[PDB]
């Protein structure tokens, strides 16, 4: 089909989308549309957001609804009702842990961003670590179900944005299981591909 | 079978849940926990948070998720893959909604609060407020599909909580759309009666 995904010049919560694309062998236009141009864009996305996917003309936006479809026309949505939801809730713990760092990474306050930090430091953090940790640990390496899914391309597509609002770019080195989910998706030969192909940004 | 959901006793972001099993028929325990006990339930959940709905012992974690489930099992998720995502796509919208107001209401100084707030009043809110004003004159009052959906019970469960967050009480004084999702979901009897036969809370 012809396929046309557009989102900003970085990973944050697009990447997921463009290595699901490379996962299904779907071929797309991979527009990278900067901060600059973004303006011309945006009237013409559902929300005045991106990530947008278009897919023969019909847009898909919000990229936690992209990835689910994306996954459930690829495969890696489970198998049931049971198992569909299981990605779904640890995908929404996953969100929890970005809108945490998110709100500390865009107060434009440098006073203000260091309160929040500590605050979180000691409250919201090491808990959702030790949570994330569990998860991984039990399902041996992957967001849910034990195995690759859907869940896994969303990690894997925002771990570095993650860690870089977090502050923390050593993060997997306490926890070493978090680069797991990264492993199994760069695992995939036509992944590993698209990635060596694709541009880098450090989030 | 045995169902029991767990939530705080406001409506804020669980009472989505509520609605739906109401909708579906299902009996069910509906444990409110206040924060007083909340200490003693935290270490039996899936995340250390609520909601948590459980049936026949299984626990189901994560508002969103949960509801996307009931839906499923409820008819109320569109009928192929393309249907059901304009329904997580819309529900998404209204998340980054919730997570903006959320962003003001949970800054505990006053101050900053009050930056933040006028911030929001020039640059987001107004473009949130027509954009979901677009999307429920185009959805016939509806969050997604132009009818019932479980877009509709979320937006319903949260809304009073969003204008509490929002402090904009009026908020539908502007824009009488807004309150149609919730006419819709209060126009289904078995919904209807557990609705008067519920506590209320201003959120």
Known sequence: ????????????????????????????????????????FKPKTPFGQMPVLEIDGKQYAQSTAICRYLGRKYGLAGANDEEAFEIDQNVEFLNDIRASAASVHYEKDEAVKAKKKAELEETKYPFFFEKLNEILTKNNGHIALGKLTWGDFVYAGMYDYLKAMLQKPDLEQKYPAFRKPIEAVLAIPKVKAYVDAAPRTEL
Chains 1, 2 share one sequence.
């Open 1 to 40: 089909p012809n396929v046309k995904f557009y989102y900003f010049p970085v990973k944050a919560l697009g990447e997921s989308q463009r290595l699901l694309l490379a996962y299904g062998g779907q071929e797309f236009e991979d527009n990278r549309i900067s901060s600059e141009n973004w303006p011309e």
